Amino acid sequence: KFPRVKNWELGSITYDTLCAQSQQDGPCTPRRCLGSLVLPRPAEQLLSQARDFINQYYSSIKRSGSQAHEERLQEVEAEVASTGTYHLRESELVFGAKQAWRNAPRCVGRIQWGKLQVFDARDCSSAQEMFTYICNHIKYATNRGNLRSAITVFPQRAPGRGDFRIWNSQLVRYAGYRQQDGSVRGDPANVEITELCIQHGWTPGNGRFDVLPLLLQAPDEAPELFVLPPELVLEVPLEHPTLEWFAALGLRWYALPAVSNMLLEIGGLEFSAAPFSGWYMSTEIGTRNLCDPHRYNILEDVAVCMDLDTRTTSSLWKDKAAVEINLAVLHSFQLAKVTIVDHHAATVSFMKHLDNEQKARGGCPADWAWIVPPISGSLTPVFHQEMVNYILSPAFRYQPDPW
Amino acid sequence: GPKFPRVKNWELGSITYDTLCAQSQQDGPCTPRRCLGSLVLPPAEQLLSQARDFINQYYSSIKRSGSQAHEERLQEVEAEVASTGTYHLRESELVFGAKQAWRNAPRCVGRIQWGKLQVFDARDCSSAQEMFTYICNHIKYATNRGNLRSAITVFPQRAPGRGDFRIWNSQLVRYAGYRQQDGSVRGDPANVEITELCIQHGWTPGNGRFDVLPLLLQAPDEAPELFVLPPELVLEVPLEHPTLEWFAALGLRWYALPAVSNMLLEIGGLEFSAAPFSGWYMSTEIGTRNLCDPHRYNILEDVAVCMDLDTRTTSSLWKDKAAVEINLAVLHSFQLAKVTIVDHHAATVSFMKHLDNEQKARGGCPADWAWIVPPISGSLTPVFHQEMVNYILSPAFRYQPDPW
Numbered sequence: 001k002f003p004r005v006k007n008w009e010l011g012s013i014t015y016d017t018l019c020a021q022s023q024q025d026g027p028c029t030p031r032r033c034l035g036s037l038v039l040p041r042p043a044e045q046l047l048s049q050a051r052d053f054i055n056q057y058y059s060s061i062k063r064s065g066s067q068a069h070e071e072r073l074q075e076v077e078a079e080v081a082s083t084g085t086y087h088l089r090e091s092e093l094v095f096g097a098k099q100a101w102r103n104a105p106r107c108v109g110r111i112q113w114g115k116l117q118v119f120d121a122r123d124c125s126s127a128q129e130m131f132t133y134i135c136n137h138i139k140y141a142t143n144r145g146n147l148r149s150a151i152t153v154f155p156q157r158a159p160g161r162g163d164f165r166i167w168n169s170q171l172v173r174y175a176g177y178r179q180q181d182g183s184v185r186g187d188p189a190n191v192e193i194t195e196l197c198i199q200h201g202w203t204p205g206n207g208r209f210d211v212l213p214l215l216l217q218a219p220d221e222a223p224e225l226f227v228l229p230p231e232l233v234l235e236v237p238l239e240h241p242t243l244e245w246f247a248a249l250g251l252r253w254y255a256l257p258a259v260s261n262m263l264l265e266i267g268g269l270e271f272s273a274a275p276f277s278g279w280y281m282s283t284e285i286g287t288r289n290l291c292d293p294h295r296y297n298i299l300e301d302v303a304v305c306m307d308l309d310t311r312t313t314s315s316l317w318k319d320k321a322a323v324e325i326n327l328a329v330l331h332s333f334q335l336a337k338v339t340i341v342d343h344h345a346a347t348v349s350f351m352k353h354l355d356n357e358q359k360a361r362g363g364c365p366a367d368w369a370w371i372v373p374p375i376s377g378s379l380t381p382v383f384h385q386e387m388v389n390y391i392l393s394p395a396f397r398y399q400p401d402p403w
Numbered sequence: 404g405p406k407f408p409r410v411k412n413w414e415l416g417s418i419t420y421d422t423l424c425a426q427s428q429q430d431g432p433c434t435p436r437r438c439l440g441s442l443v444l445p446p447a448e449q450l451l452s453q454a455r456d457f458i459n460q461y462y463s464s465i466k467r468s469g470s471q472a473h474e475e476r477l478q479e480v481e482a483e484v485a486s487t488g489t490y491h492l493r494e495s496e497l498v499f500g501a502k503q504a505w506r507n508a509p510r511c512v513g514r515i516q517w518g519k520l521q522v523f524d525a526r527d528c529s530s531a532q533e534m535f536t537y538i539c540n541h542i543k544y545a546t547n548r549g550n551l552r553s554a555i556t557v558f559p560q561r562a563p564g565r566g567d568f569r570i571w572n573s574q575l576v577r578y579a580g581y582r583q584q585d586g587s588v589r590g591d592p593a594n595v596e597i598t599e600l601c602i603q604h605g606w607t608p609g610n611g612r613f614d615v616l617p618l619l620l621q622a623p624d625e626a627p628e629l630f631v632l633p634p635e636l637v638l639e640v641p642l643e644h645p646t647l648e649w650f651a652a653l654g655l656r657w658y659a660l661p662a663v664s665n666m667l668l669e670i671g672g673l674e675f676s677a678a679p680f681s682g683w684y685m686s687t688e689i690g691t692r693n694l695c696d697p698h699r700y701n702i703l704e705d706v707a708v709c710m711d712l713d714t715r716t717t718s719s720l721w722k723d724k725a726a727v728e729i730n731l732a733v734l735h736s737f738q739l740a741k742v743t744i745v746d747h748h749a750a751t752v753s754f755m756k757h758l759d760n761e762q763k764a765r766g767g768c769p770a771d772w773a774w775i776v777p778p779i780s781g782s783l784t785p786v787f788h789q790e791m792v793n794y795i796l797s798p799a800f801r802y803q804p805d806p807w
């Protein structure tokens with residue numbers, strides 16, 4: 001049996017047959033659905049994931065079952081048989097990274113999946129070197145406001161030894177300073193990484209938008225501190241197209257969303273440092289990062305400037321302030337010529353992606369709770385679209401924090 | 404930690420474990436290999452175990468579990484089943500079961516109110532005309548001149564070898580949907596089919612955007628029959644906006660009483676195929692889904708044009724700004740008309756209080772995140788940041804096939 005998938009706005013029906021290729025088990029059983037949880041709770045098998053991945057690569061280039069195809073499967077068998085592991089060709093790595101993005105059920109930006117610059121950094125042997133590669137990535141990805149998707153791939157995990165790791169969850173993060181009295185100055189999401197930085201010797205500031213240094217770690221070594229050169233870190237002050245006092249709030253955000261704590265798995269190999277970046281969807285900044293209660297939490301302050309009736313929920317002051325904040329983000333990014341996409345444009349392009357994927361592959365793994373944006377859900381088309389969530393490889397996965 | 408689902412609140416950092424899911428006898432649509440949580444829709448000795456189960460639940464609820472009364476009720480149930488193949492619920496069993504079915508409904512955000520539910524027994528009903536008197540009575544009590552009270556009326560259970568009692572309409576109040584020559588719809592496109600059924604059974608149609616439909620009511624093994632609700636029983640609220648003076652000119656309105664009439668109520672294996680129940684609205688149901696879905700009244704562009712927004716580019720957020728104002732108009736006009744309504748901020752806050760009560764009372768609460776989170780301003784409400792475990796418990800409200 002294959003899932004019947006319905007869109008309730010159009011009345012149309014598809015069948016997901018792609019999920020039959022699912023590698024791994026998710027959190028759900030017939031007795032209870034755990035879909036809304038954010039986090040999850042040797043050689044024969046590395047070999048089979050390797051074979052499987054190599055079969056996909058050769059299929060992708062239509063040279064499947066050919067000479068090169070069997071010689072490569074032989075290489076993999078011969079390398080695993082004597083070292084217990086193997087290595088990807090650079091073009092196999094490029095294919096894997098793009099497929100890992102393609103497969104990410106929670107990503108709304110997947111229409112872009114084929115366009116991704118891949119920097120091979122597997123020849124790194126120190127924290128210093130990683131920092132070199134990280135500066136290259138940021139300078140490349142930012143491209144003065146004209147953002148380009150990219151991923152840098154540091155050396156794979158190895159049975160012996162500790163992992164290459166970037167300790168920060170993103171390459172650009174604002175410090176969060178826990179005050180005497182429990183309040184937080186800056187981004188509350190970053191209190192622990194901020195504390196790690198200081199303790200590994202960083203001199204802190206006391207702003208709300210102090211860009212953190214990076215903690216980079218080469219195997220079985222103490223991590224090292226590196227400051228990003230400020231001219232590499234593009235930022236957009238926030239203002240509103242009609243509310244003149246908004247700029248006064250002194251709010252801002254960085255251009256480049258570069259996730260750096262996830263693990264990339266391709267054909268059994270695991271890449272524990274492989275930072276990747278695209279461009280922001282404006283609700284991530286306008287709704288979540290600035291309005292979440294446990295993040296910068298600015299709703300009430302804006303509502304008061306707007307001079308709204310804060311005393312009651314039913315004046316919808318929250319809803320109103322949130323819309324002006326998102327509009328400020330969009331306006332400000334467009335003004336500064338920095339790539340951003342609104343939640344309506346993004347979800348329309350994601351619907352076109354579902355359709356492309358339906359033809360290309362027979363389905364598309366999608367996580368409905370993550371795909372529908374955090375404001376105006378049912379005003380976007382994805383809300384009315386049933387989706388099927390499941391795990392395909394290559395994949396991005398969570399991994400434990402290295403400390 | 405323990406061997407049950409760990410549940411996290413990401414805003415507050417707190418953790419619970421759901422042990423209630425262990426009580427689930429019925430499976431849902433998910434498996435280890437894929438999640439189907441976002442899909443809208445996924446006996447003999449068999450009756451006996453559902454019955455025995457429900458009777459145990461009843462005796463626990465009255466703290467008389469294991470008692471001689473408890474064991475005599477079980478034998479009473481097996482006696483009756485054994486000789487007729489079915490059995491009857493005591494009155495208090497039916498009240499308990501109705502409340503528990505609402506308590507159990509994973510998609511309902513209003514469950515903080517579950518113990519406060521007025522249950523009309525109409526298990527004696529025996530004609531379509533009589534079902535109509537009960538329904539009028541329900542609408543009268545439940546509306547209460549604007550001060551809405553939750554209620555369910557329960558009609559006779561399925562019975563082996565006799566047809567069912569059915570209310571054909573999906574709600575007791577529904578606006579007509581008239582299919583046009585040009586292929587569009589006047590009124591509510593959700594009601595096209597029921598509207599066409601009503602006409603085919605002899606209703607003379609209107610041609611307004613808000614024509615109240617008649618009810619089609621079917622007694623056992625009979626063609627359904629048509630009943631027009633007297634207009635003074637159907638309370639309606641004209642929509643205006645607190646500051647946008649022109650909003651009233653749009654002539655939009657909504658009824659006071661949300662009453663669902665097509666779900667099956669299942670209690671200890673018995674099936675109440677007609678058991679309409681009503682509460683009060685949460686404002687986003689009307690202001691966001693009913694008035695702004697593309698496939699419903701679809702008014703967002705009309706309202707944004709009147710507000711003079713730039714509807715030619717997504718990035719002006721015209722949709723979000725118009726939806727906010729339509730929601731504000733629904734809240735303001737209900738308040739003004741003194742008709743009970745609840746906004747999505749108050750409703751979700753209260754539902755978090757419900758989760759905390761149920762966590763202490765039963766060790767968890769089955770809940771369907773995609774339906775509990777409201778269709779605007781999702782992450783500005785606390786439910787967005789609450790993980791939720793979804794499973795089926797009984798007594799239950801269930802979907803059932805349409806009778807035609």
Ligand code: HEM
Binds near residue numbers: 101
């Ligand atoms: C091109 C512009 C892109 C946009 C607008 C975009 C949008 C998003 C958004 C909004 C999320 C949810 C983020 C959150 O709520 O925390 C997300 C998740 C994700 N995206 Fe993207 N994305 C883009 C590019 C990329 C790229 C280049 C990759 C990797 C090569 C990627 C992989 C992911 C993954 C793995 C997730 C899931 C994160 C998790 O499980 O926590 N995306 N995307």
Ligand code: HEM
Binds near residue numbers: 800
């Ligand atoms: C008292 C005020 C109540 C409020 C505010 C309320 C709120 C809601 C909302 C917003 C929904 C989701 C509707 C949708 O978008 O389709 C819903 C679903 C539901 N509520 Fe309520 N509810 C209330 C009372 C009741 C009562 C009195 C019952 C039954 C005794 C009930 C049983 C249900 C059920 C069974 C569902 C979902 C069934 C489904 O669509 O699959 N609720 N509730």
Ligand SMILES: CNCCN(C)c1cc(F)cc(CCc2cc(C)cc(N)n2)c1
Binds near residue numbers: 259262276278281
């Ligand atoms: C709190 N969520 C988990 C943190 N995390 C590991 C994360 C992962 C992502 F893929 C994406 C994001 C959001 C950042 C992002 C990343 C990318 C590549 C594009 C984009 N528009 N936004 C966070």
Ligand SMILES: CNCCN(C)c1cc(F)cc(CCc2cc(C)cc(N)n2)c1
Binds near residue numbers: 479480483491492494
């Ligand atoms: C409100 N509905 C009835 C209350 N109730 C559970 C009950 C009533 C009886 F008269 C007798 C019994 C005992 C079982 C039994 C036995 C027989 C022969 C018939 C019948 N209707 N019921 C239960």
Ligand SMILES: CNCCN(C)c1cc(F)cc(CCc2cc(C)cc(N)n2)c1
Binds near residue numbers: 513662
């Ligand atoms: C896909 N399902 C839509 C139709 N349907 C069967 C339905 C069922 C409900 F319980 C509730 C609703 C929503 C109406 C409602 C019903 C009640 C009792 C209270 C309230 N605020 N709102 C619809």
Ligand SMILES: C[C@H](O)[C@H](O)[C@H]1CNc2nc(N)[nH]c(=O)c2N1
Binds near residue numbers: 369
């Ligand atoms: C508990 C809940 O699943 C959690 O808050 C999720 C919901 N959906 C989300 N969707 C996106 N895009 N990002 C998120 O962080 C979350 N958070």
Ligand SMILES: C[C@H](O)[C@H](O)[C@H]1CNc2nc(N)[nH]c(=O)c2N1
Binds near residue numbers: 383
């Ligand atoms: C496809 C998707 O599951 C469907 O549109 C759901 C989503 N969430 C919902 N939530 C509520 N309260 N009501 C609904 O009708 C829906 N529809």
Ligand SMILES: [Zn+2]
Binds near residue numbers: 032
């Ligand atoms: Zn599931």
